[PDB]
């Protein structure tokens, strides 16, 4: 009965296992985003158990509502109505350190959040970090699509968070969890690298091969010198290559972006215009040719 509360308008993406679309709810006439996902396809109970949850975070993508009609589930959550937050970021021609550090640290509080809760992101591209709306201010920013979320259980399978370690838990998914948490601020590097010069650490654009991409992200050494990088604080760059460090065991966590300098000392950061590349189109490609690479054995 979604489409008796719900009328559904045009698809916002279309995916193997799953659309999304716009839709209305008749009695209030307020906009929604629908997520309608084939049950046959795919099983989504994990994604709605942490929505349900953990949705009430400020920055979390909200859910409005939940249907099932036997053959698809229908997840109801906010439209994000102020596009993708990088791209809108790239095309703000005067954007300064001080706005990228205000950016990170409330993308950065939330998944402190849920990795203190058990909870790993693991898709965290930013295709999946957006706005609400176009405010323009933190409180709009969300990160969205839990479908490839997992909450930490012990062996006898109880939801367990890192700290209640007086259950047993093979270290072995402690420490694949210890992985893809580390994975989740990688991806925060990535973004943070990006938002600072207008170009990705890893790729050029969408014609680069998976095989370049991964030896990149294998040699461990990226650039933060040169033109666009050169006039950016040393704080900054020091914090960027501890995020993106190549041994996901010495990366900062969540926990420690959080206590850096150019996190903590914002307001001694510089408000006038970094110095980009200005190709956000060129970037959207190298960025998704990044994660193709980084996932093609899922
Ligand atoms: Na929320």
Same mark, same amino acid.
């Given at each position: 009965?979604?489409?008796?509360?719900?009328?559904?308008?045009?698809?916002?993406?279309?995916?193997?296992?799953?659309?999304?679309?716009? %839709?209305?709810?008749?009695?209030?006439?307020?906009?929604?985003?629908?997520?309608?996902?084939?049950?046959?396809?795919?099983?989504?109970?994990?994604?709605?158990?942490?929505?349900?949850?953990?949705?009430?975070?400020?920055?979390?993508?909200?859910?409005?509502?939940?249907?099932?009609?036997?053959?698809?589930?229908?997840?109801?959550?906010?439209?994000?109505?102020?596009?993708?937050?990088?791209?809108?970021?790239?095309?703000?021609?005067? /954007?300064?350190?001080?706005?990228?550090?205000?950016?990170? /640290?409330?993308?950065?509080?939330?998944?402190?959040?849920? &990795?203190? *809760?058990?909870?790993?992101?693991?898709?965290?591209?930013?295709?999946?970090?957006?706005?609400?709306?176009? =405010?323009?201010?933190?409180?709009?920013?969300?990160? %969205?699509? /839990?479908?490839?979320?997992?909450?930490?259980?012990?062996?006898?399978?109880?939801?367990?968070?890192?700290?209640?370690?007086?259950? /047993?838990?093979?270290?072995?998914?402690?420490?694949? *969890?210890?992985?893809?948490?580390?994975?989740?601020?990688?991806?925060?590097?990535?973004?943070?690298?990006?938002?600072?010069?207008?170009?990705?650490?890893?790729?050029?654009?969408?014609?680069?091969?998976?095989?370049?991409?991964?030896?990149?992200?294998? =040699?461990?050494?990226?650039?933060? =010198?040169?033109?666009?990088?050169?006039?950016?604080?040393?704080?900054?760059?020091?914090?960027?290559?501890?995020?993106? &460090?190549?041994?996901?065991?010495?990366?900062?966590?969540?926990?420690?972006?959080?206590?850096?300098?150019?996190?903590?000392?914002?307001?001694?950061?510089? *408000?006038? *215009?970094?110095?980009?590349?200005?190709?956000?189109?060129?970037?959207?490609?190298?960025?998704?040719?990044?994660? =193709?690479?980084?996932?093609?054995?899922?």
């Amino acid at each position: 009965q979604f489409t008796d509360g719900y009328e559904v308008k045009e698809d916002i993406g279309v995916g193997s296992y799953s659309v999304c679309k716009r %839709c209305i709810h008749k009695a209030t006439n307020m906009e929604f985003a629908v997520k309608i996902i084939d049950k046959s396809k795919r099983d989504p109970t994990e994604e709605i158990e942490i929505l349900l949850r953990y949705g009430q975070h400020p920055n979390i993508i909200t859910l409005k509502d939940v249907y099932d009609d036997g053959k698809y589930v229908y997840v109801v959550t906010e439209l994000m109505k102020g596009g993708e937050l990088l791209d809108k970021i790239l095309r703000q021609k005067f /954007f300064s350190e001080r706005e990228a550090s205000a950016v990170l /640290f409330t993308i950065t509080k939330t998944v402190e959040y849920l &990795h203190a *809760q058990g909870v790993v992101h693991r898709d965290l591209k930013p295709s999946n970090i957006l706005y609400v709306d176009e =405010s323009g201010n933190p409180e709009s920013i969300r990160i %969205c699509d /839990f479908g490839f979320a997992k909450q930490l259980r012990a062996e006898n399978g109880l939801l367990m968070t890192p700290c209640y370690t007086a259950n /047993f838990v093979a270290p072995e998914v402690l420490e694949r *969890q210890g992985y893809d948490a580390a994975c989740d601020i990688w991806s925060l590097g990535v973004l943070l690298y990006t938002m600072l010069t207008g170009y990705t650490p890893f790729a050029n654009g969408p014609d680069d091969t998976p095989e370049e991409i991964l030896a990149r992200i294998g =040699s461990g050494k990226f650039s933060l =010198s040169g033109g666009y990088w050169n006039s950016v604080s040393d704080t900054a760059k020091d914090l960027v290559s501890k995020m993106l &460090h190549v041994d996901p065991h010495q990366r900062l966590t969540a926990a420690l972006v959080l206590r850096h300098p150019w996190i903590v000392h914002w307001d001694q950061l510089p *408000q006038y *215009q970094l110095n980009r590349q200005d190709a956000p189109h060129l970037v959207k490609g190298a960025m998704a040719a990044t994660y =193709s690479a980084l996932n093609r054995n899922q």
